[PDB]
């Protein structure tokens, strides 16, 4: 295999050149220049609300744009819209398949989406003249489970799947417009940029990739983790993102530096991360773990600022409101908690 | 609380009533995960769902068959099923080690450590035909078979060749060795010899699920 030898050779050369190019840019470290700022202090959040009603493990949740309504998905095959202020249940949506793995809430609030082992992303119309919630579109074409879906507008949605691909869908026609290929393992998470012109994805190959929505090509690849990446979240200003993996670590990557800036880990932390999110200022990084707990991190100093304890089982999802007013945590004990 | 707030509260209470009605039927149903291989024959025994109601108890078995060959991620969805039904092709010595490795990974997984496994050894007629033929040899793939002796508690069918019984019980004990090596009693293995024309598999699954839940109740009440 002389030709394959030659191609592996060019790739080793380019990967050592890229590594050298990144090394020639690390003048200092993020922890080096943030050593002179005051510590964030101790953060102590309290469970302000507890949402009960799901009959099995909660797999996903998404905050509404108004920071009051949220949708949750559970193993029982049900979608529930909640009023976080009053704990009232606004809608209860039965699902054809009980193996849902993701849920999303349209920024306009008119649609919710879900998907899972059925390999189909289902769109539900919340505002119908008949007064009920009806499935509006079933997006088919993925060969592998749906792991994440996010709305761009009322007619555009980006999905990640278990066939190592991501797709951009036209909801009106139900057809894929762009396909994002290049990952090696299952794509577990995706995160849209604030301007929705780019998005990052984390896959089961210890790698994260940056994609251009319009061009439909990979821009950069970030490889610092050691096991499968389960969560990804963009920095509030859109110039960085954080990832959580099964290596029991959280890492921060910069887009214009093309390398990792900090690692959030401790020798006594041996549990994988299931979800990450940022406070609306970006100073605090919140991560949920397998050990039933969530950790609050000083994102600029890699110091643990607090914990979110009170769940009886694995923390499966995590989210912060668009106004930065509260944090919602889902867990395998079938409850949702709002923290402040 | 304004009138519209009270009406919203009443709607929420109606939703909660519907949720309780759903909770009853959810708790009354037992979910099973069907696992195997291409040649296992589990289809006789892209999600292929089936429902049966042996002795008025509802059972719901799932067969995930629309995914890639990597299963370390989607298999965590089934951490709360009553039992896992593992089907192997007992006559295929070449693929036996792959099945044993998959069984070990399922048994020792962190999220699947509490699930009991019902083991079906499917193609026993083909196993008997292959053993009586004499062409293929188990000791080629499993060198320890030469030092194996039939267990004293074995219950062979009358008229069955002792060679067939020895091969059958060696293959069963191969999985039982993995099952008894860890898990310290939180979960158990129920092996069954099966056939393509077996009509009593539902009763076996019913009995195994009954035993699993009875053992769980005994454990939770400090009665072991």
């Amino acid at each position, epitope marked *: 295999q002389s030709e394959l030898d030659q191609l592996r050779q060019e790739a080793e050369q380019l990967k050592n050149q890229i590594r050298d190019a990144r090394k020639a840019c690390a003048d200092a470290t993020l922890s080096q220049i943030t050593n002179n700022i005051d510590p964030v202090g101790r953060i102590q959040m309290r469970t302000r609300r507890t949402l009960r009603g799901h009959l099995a493990k909660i797999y996903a949740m998404h905050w509404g744009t108004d920071s009051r309504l949220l949708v949750s998905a559970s193993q029982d095959g049900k979608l529930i819209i909640w009023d976080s202020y009053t704990t009232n249940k606004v809608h209860a949506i039965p699902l054809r398949s009980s193996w849902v793995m993701t849920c999303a809430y349209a920024p306009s609030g008119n649609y919710v989406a879900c998907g899972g082992l059925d390999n189909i992303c289902s769109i539900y119309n919340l505002k119908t003249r008949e007064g009920n919630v009806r499935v509006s579109r079933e997006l088919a074409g993925h060969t592998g489970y749906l792991s994440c879906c996010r709305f761009l507008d009322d007619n555009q949605i980006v999905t990640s799947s278990g066939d190592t691909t991501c797709a951009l869908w036209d909801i009106e026609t139900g057809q894929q417009t762009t396909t994002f290929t290049g990952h090696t393992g299952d794509v577990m998470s995706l995160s849209l940029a604030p301007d929705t012109r780019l998005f990052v994805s984390g896959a*089961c190959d*210890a790698s994260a990739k940056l994609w251009d929505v319009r061009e439909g090509m990979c821009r950069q690849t970030f490889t610092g983790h*050691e*096991s499968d990446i389960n969560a990804i979240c963009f920095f509030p200003n859109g110039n960085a993102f954080a990832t959580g993996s*099964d*290596d029991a670590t959280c890492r921060l990557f910069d887009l214009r530096a093309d390398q990792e800036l900090m690692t959030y880990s401790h020798d006594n932390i041996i549990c994988g991360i299931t979800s990450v999110s940022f406070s609306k200022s970006g100073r605090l990084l919140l991560a949920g773990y397998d050990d039933f707990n969530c950790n609050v991190w000083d994102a600029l100093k890699a110091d643990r600022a607090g914990v979110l304890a009170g769940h009886d089982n694995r923390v499966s999802c995590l989210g912060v409101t668009d106004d930065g007013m509260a944090v919602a945590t889902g867990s395998w004990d079938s409850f949702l908690k709002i923290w402040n | 609380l304004s009138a519209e707030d009270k009406a919203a509260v009443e709607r929420s209470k109606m939703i909660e009533k519907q949720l309780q009605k759903d909770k009853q039927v959810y708790r009354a149903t037992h979910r099973l995960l069907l696992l195997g291989a291409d040649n296992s024959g589990k289809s006789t025994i892209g999600i292929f769902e089936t429902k049966f109601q042996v002795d008025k108890v509802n059972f719901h078995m799932f067969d995930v068959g629309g995914q890639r060959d990597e299963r*370390r991620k989607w298999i965590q969805c089934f951490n709360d099923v009553t039992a896992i039904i593992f089907v192997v092709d007992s006559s295929d010595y070449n693929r036996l*080690q*792959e099945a044993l490795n998959l069984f070990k990974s399922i048994w*020792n997984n962190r999220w699947l450590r509490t699930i009991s496994v019902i083991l079906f050894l499917n193609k026993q007629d083909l196993l008997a035909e292959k053993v009586l033929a004499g062409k293929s040899k188990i000791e080629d793939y499993f060198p320890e078979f030469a030092r194996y002796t039939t267990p004293e508690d074995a219950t062979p069918e009358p008229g069955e060749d002792p060679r067939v019984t020895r091969a059958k019980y060696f293959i069963r004990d191969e999985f039982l060795r993995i099952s008894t090596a860890s898990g310290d009693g939180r979960h158990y293995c129920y092996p069954h010899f099966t056939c393509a024309v077996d009509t009593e598999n539902a009763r076996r699954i019913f009995n195994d699920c009954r035993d699993i839940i009875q053992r769980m109740h005994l454990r939770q009440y400090e009665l072991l």
Partner: nanobody, 128 residues
Framework: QVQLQESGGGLVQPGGSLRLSCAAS????????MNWVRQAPGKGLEWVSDISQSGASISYTGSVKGRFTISRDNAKNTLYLQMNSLKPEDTAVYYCARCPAPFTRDCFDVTSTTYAYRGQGTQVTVSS
């Protein structure tokens, strides 16, 4: 990132011996269970052996029992597979595969068609 480089494979006569080495980088070597996987021509990937994190627990496939020896050097971040009394049935591309997660006794998908934490492979040919 995670890198596995396999070396030591070549052409030997039946009954000969070979030693394969797998140098690992980009992850904490001592935290993972390691495996050796091979693929014979016109056949699927087959598990051969595994070594635990500390090397206390060792497993072998039946076709290789008594002829293959697996060991790991945690200080040197390298894995070995000593092969003795080779036969033509051992002709294959041998891969050094790592378990997906640390601190686990389970090892999923190491023999899958496209597994991320697996090396490129080294060819061993046994022929006269």
């Amino acid at each position: 990132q995670v890198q596995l480089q396999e070396s030591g494979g070549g052409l030997v006569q039946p009954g000969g011996s070979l030693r394969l080495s797998c140098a690992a980088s980009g992850f904490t070597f001592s935290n993972y269970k390691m495996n050796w996987v091979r693929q014979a021509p016109g056949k699927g990937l087959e598990w051969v052996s595994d070594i635990s994190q500390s090397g206390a627990s060792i497993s072998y496939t039946g076709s290789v029992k008594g002829r293959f020896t697996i060991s790991r050097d945690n200080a040197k971040n390298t894995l070995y597979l000593q092969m003795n009394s080779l036969k033509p049935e051992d002709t294959a591309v041998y891969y050094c595969a790592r378990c997906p997660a640390p601190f686990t006794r389970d090892c999923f998908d190491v023999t899958s068609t496209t597994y991320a934490y697996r090396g490129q492979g080294t060819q061993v040919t046994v022929s006269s």
